From a paper:
The largest cohort of CRL SRs recognizing terminal degrons are the four BC-box proteins in the KLHDC-family (hereafter collectively referred to as KLHDCX), KLHDC1, KLHDC2, KLHDC3, and KLHDC1031,32. These SRs all feature Kelch-type 6-bladed β-propellers that recognize C-degrons bearing terminal Gly residues. Members of the KLHDCX family employ Kelch-type 6-bladed β-propellers to bind substrates, and a BC-box binding EloB/C that serve as bridges to a cullin (CUL2 or CUL5). Importantly, we discovered that these E3s share a defining C-terminal carboxylate-anchoring element (R/F-S-R) establishing them as C-degron E3s.
To gain insights into the structural roles of penultimate residues within the degron sequences recognized by KLHDC3, the crystal structures of KLHDC3 bound to ubiquitin harboring Gly75Arg or Gly75Gln mutations were resolved to 2.6 and 1.9 Å resolution, respectively. The structures superimposed with the wild-type ubiquitin-KLHDC3 complex with 0.23 and 0.09 RMSD over main chain atoms, respectively. Both mutant degrons engage the KLHDC3 binding pocket in a similar manner as for wild-type ubiquitin. In particular, Asp325 forms extensive interactions with side-chain atoms from the substrate ubiquitin’s Arg or Gln. Mutation of ubiquitin’s Gly75 to the consensus degron residues Arg or Gln resulted in ~3- and ~2-fold tighter binding, respectively. As expected, the Asp325Ala mutant KLHDC3 was relatively defective in comparison with the wild-type E3, but only towards substrates that contained an Arg residue in the penultimate position of the degron sequence. For example, adjacent to the C-terminal Gly-binding site in KLHDC3, an aliphatic/acidic pocket determines preference for a Gly/C-degron’s penultimate Gln or Arg. The shape of the KLHDC3 pocket and acidic nature of adjacent surfaces explains this E3’s general preference for Arg residues in substrate C-terminal regions.
Author numbering:
A (entry chain A): 1 to 313, 321 to 377
B (entry chain C): 17 to 50, 58 to 112
C (entry chain B): 1 to 97
D (entry chain D): 1 to 76
Write the structure that this text describes.
Amino acid sequence: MLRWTVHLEGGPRRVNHAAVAVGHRVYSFGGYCSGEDYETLRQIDVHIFNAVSLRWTKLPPVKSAIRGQAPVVPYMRYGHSTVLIDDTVLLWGGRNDTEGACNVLYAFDVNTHKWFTPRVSGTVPGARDGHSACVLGKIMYIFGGYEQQADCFSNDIHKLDTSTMTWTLICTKGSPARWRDFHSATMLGSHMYVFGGRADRFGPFHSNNEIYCNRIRVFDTRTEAWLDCPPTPVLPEGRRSHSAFGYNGELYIFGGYNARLNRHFHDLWKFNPVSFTWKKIEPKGKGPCPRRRQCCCIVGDKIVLFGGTSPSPFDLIDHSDLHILDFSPSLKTLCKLAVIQYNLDQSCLPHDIRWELNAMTTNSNISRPI
Amino acid sequence: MYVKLISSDGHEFIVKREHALTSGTIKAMLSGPGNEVNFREIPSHVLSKVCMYFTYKVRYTNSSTEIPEFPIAPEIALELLMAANFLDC
Amino acid sequence: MDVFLMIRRHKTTIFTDAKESSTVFELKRIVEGILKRPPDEQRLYKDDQLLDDGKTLGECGFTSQTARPQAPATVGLAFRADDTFEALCIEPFSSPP
Amino acid sequence: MQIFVKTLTGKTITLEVEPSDTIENVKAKIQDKEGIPPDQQRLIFAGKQLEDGRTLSDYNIQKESTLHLVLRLRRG
């Protein structure tokens, strides 16, 4: 049973970034960090965490393809979304402080690392931050977020059909989920599960009536309808900037922040769509400290969790650490953890084991402590 | 249905074949060309613990109810780690 | 519900599970299919207490809380020798340094 | 006269102002007293978003009243 097995430092110090897993490597894009520059013209960022060697690397700046043309790469931003379809990360949305939000679709090839901006057609969603993105087949689904031009929360679903690069504003049936940002949306089968996020209890505008959603909402992509679903007797506290992932057919949500309670979270909740029920999960080991707007990616039976913001022991810090939650720890993993914990001499061990012990106990050098 | 795992000091451990398959190494050995396995290098106090891990793993896979941890005494951790690495489990 | 067991005789150790409600005799028939000796040629013990064929494991004291998969409860086994039974004898596992 | 600005988490910021001052003025004084650029600021009174052009007396903000400060969620 599931356990926090790795805690590593020296990664990118980022919150409000976006990341996808490609094989056993996690690609992290952009994000915010206090004290660093989010006004001037900077290229967006790509750091890669290797989940076998447990090393962070960073990709070098994008160069101009032809003299006189600018490099093709999104500007440094936060609150954007990234999804993976085949060999392509689709990056959309977000903002920086200067240029605000842009709604240009960006594509990133995970093998060649070239960026491009495929020509799209249809009703392009307005620029926004804090939306959710998820995919089913060749279709990307964008929901929610805070629209920069309309200046409002969104409860639209825009789908991008990457086969033709065509945006559709979906005319949904049923009661749409409440306008909101910094929610999550997770695909389980053909159904999109929307949880949490910041919202207004009366409408799509800020009005000093901010609320933290916890009535999960379900969107069927086959019939493009919001479903009416049974009550959940037990449910997690409302929150924003949690992480959501689907593993073995079930939804998991980690962490987040509730402003009404002024509380950061490091809990773990499982939702089973079939029983339609929630359950708080207690992993073994010391997890990450309560935090919000970290990123979570799935690598086999493990979740790579890294980044985010939390209060500083009003006085927030950004995280360069990284955690691994292992849903099914091998005996070898439990024994390395014991050898580390009891601080036993490792020089008897064969070099393959020692390489592993070293990997899980050595910081990367993207960042230094503040 | 059951298989026999013999330790270096000659203890015999009879475990469900499905449990022993938790070890990739044993999985390979039971499917060799042309049932029991002799481990000339793993003593009984280590191999008994490995079998308990088999039982624990199969029983608690895809389980979310809270359960005890798999206890690993310091005096056994280095040998157990070397065994788990050799057994790919 | 489930009790996780080690049935031990000399240098033999069987790992198996059973229900709290299953009987000592059912336990003997698992041994029979492994070690090819019938129940009437077996004695099963909880520590030093001989176990009756018709008691359930729970009635003998085996509880799921104390027979967990990572900490199986031990059941001693003795075979009939000729007209009499061998003494219950369990060889200890080796010891760490 | 004086007014207060409070975010959802807390941290009152009492500001010295007069009714003629615009909402842009109050965002300016807030930046002086907390180091928050006005573009990341959203002031709300009586559940209405305050326009940068209208002044304080245009929204009926008398002495001792509190405005609500909403910020860009740069850190989520």
